[PDB]
Nucleic acid binder design. Structure first.
Ligand SMILES: Cc1cn([C@H]2C[C@H](O)[C@@H](COP(=O)(O)OP(=O)(O)OP(=O)(O)O)O2)c(=O)[nH]c1=O
Ligand SMILES: [Mg+2]
Ligand code: NA
Ligand code: NA
Ligand code: NA
Length: 323
DNA sequence: GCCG
DNA sequence: CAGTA
DNA sequence: CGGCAGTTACTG
């Protein structure tokens, strides 16, 4: 509900690509609140009443109804669409997009022929369209299975779980998030080397984006893969290997959504605790600015439910975390 | 941008 | 580190 | 005034 959002969503992306992350966050929250309410908004007071919507935002919602158009939109820089185009290249963010624009680049052809690309950005440009597409969850299953098969091939005890949007039950997935760990709490160490080389053997992996294979403590692998046969597109792969003791927090984190994690972490903070993909801690010592000064104590969290419990929150199935 |  | 994830 | 997730994990 509420298509007075699609117009704010435009301003949100504009601010975001331009690097004004906080203002963009504000819009994201407001847009989210509107899309989450039960009835069409038709009153200034009805807008301010909504948490996440202030005078400024409501003031704009008023015009969206009293005018049917937002004057602010007719003043967005012409650079925005190009910044969005550029920042949609994997490995390039607002800073790079703005730099390229300042240098006169206006299209991907300009980037391809004149820009100095990092290894990651070159891969992103090579798969520009594929990286903007989502795959049916069915294909995500095959990819997760492909990774699990290669993993359990050298250690049948390894536990592999597809997380992210997949575990949240979404019909399509941006990429495939696979969490790998081992019940014995030690057999997870230094497996990337073997797993990745195995996946490379069968020609499954096509490009590596983030993979510190010289570090025996590598925690993640971000890359590209493709299943065999016709009609197959290059798909993004995200693999993390975590120690069993961090299984719950890691599973919770990797399942998301990102907004859900942020909300949960923000809550933990208001309660003198801290939550991360590594652990839930209590008695955390923070400064006047909120930065974690003291480590506090790690709380035992053998399951996701324990995390919710310790935070005094009712448990939520992955599908109920799709924020 | 919103909010404490 | 800044940038991007 | 000043936080808005994580003292998150790589890259160069
Ligand atoms: C991007 C991002 C992800 N995460 C966590 C929660 C996400 O579910 C998980 C994996 O990230 P993503 O794969 O980016 O998210 P997603 O799988 O939910 O959505 P998509 O289908 O587009 O891939 O990592 C964060 O905590 N913060 C972030 O900023
Ligand atoms: Mg994903
Ligand atoms: Na990008
Ligand atoms: Na590498
Ligand atoms: Na991912």
């Amino acid at each position: 509900n509420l298509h007075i959002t699609e117009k704010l969503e435009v301003l949100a992306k504009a601010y975001s690509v331009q690097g004004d992350k906080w203002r963009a966050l504000g819009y994201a929250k407001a847009i989210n609140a509107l899309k989450s309410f039960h009835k069409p908004v038709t009153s200034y007071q009805e807008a301010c009443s909504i948490p996440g919507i202030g005078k400024r935002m409501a003031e704009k919602i008023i015009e969206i109804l009293e005018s049917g158009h937002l004057r602010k939109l007719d003043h967005i820089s012409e650079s925005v669409p190009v910044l969005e185009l550029f920042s949609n290249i994997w490995g390039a963010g607002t800073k790079t997009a703005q730099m390229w624009y300042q240098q006169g680049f206006r299209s991907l052809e300009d980037i391809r022929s004149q820009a100095s690309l990092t290894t990651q950005q070159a891969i992103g440009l090579k798969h520009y369209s594929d990286f903007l597409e989502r795959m049916p969850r069915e294909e995500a299953t095959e990819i997760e299975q492909t990774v699990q098969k290669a993993a359990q091939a050298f250690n049948s005890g390894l536990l592999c779980v597809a997380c992210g949007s997949y575990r949240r039950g979404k019909a399509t997935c941006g990429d495939v998030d696979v969490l790998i760990t081992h019940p014995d709490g030690r057999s997870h160490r230094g497996i990337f080397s073997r797993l990745l080389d195995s996946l490379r053997q069968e020609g499954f992996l096509t490009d590596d984006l983030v993979s510190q294979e010289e570090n025996g403590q590598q925690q993640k692998y971000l890359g590209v893969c493709r299943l065999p046969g016709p009609g197959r597109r290059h798909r993004r792969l995200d693999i993390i290997v975590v120690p069993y003791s961090e299984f719950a927090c890691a599973l919770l984190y990797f399942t998301g959504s990102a907004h859900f994690n942020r909300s949960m972490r923000a809550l933990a903070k208001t309660k003198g605790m801290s939550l991360s993909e590594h652990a839930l801690s209590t008695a955390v010592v923070r400064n006047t600015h909120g930065c974690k000064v003291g480590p506090g104590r790690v709380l035992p969290t053998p399951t996701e439910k324990d995390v919710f419990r310790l935070l005094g929150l009712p448990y939520r199935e992955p599908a109920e975390r799709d924020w």
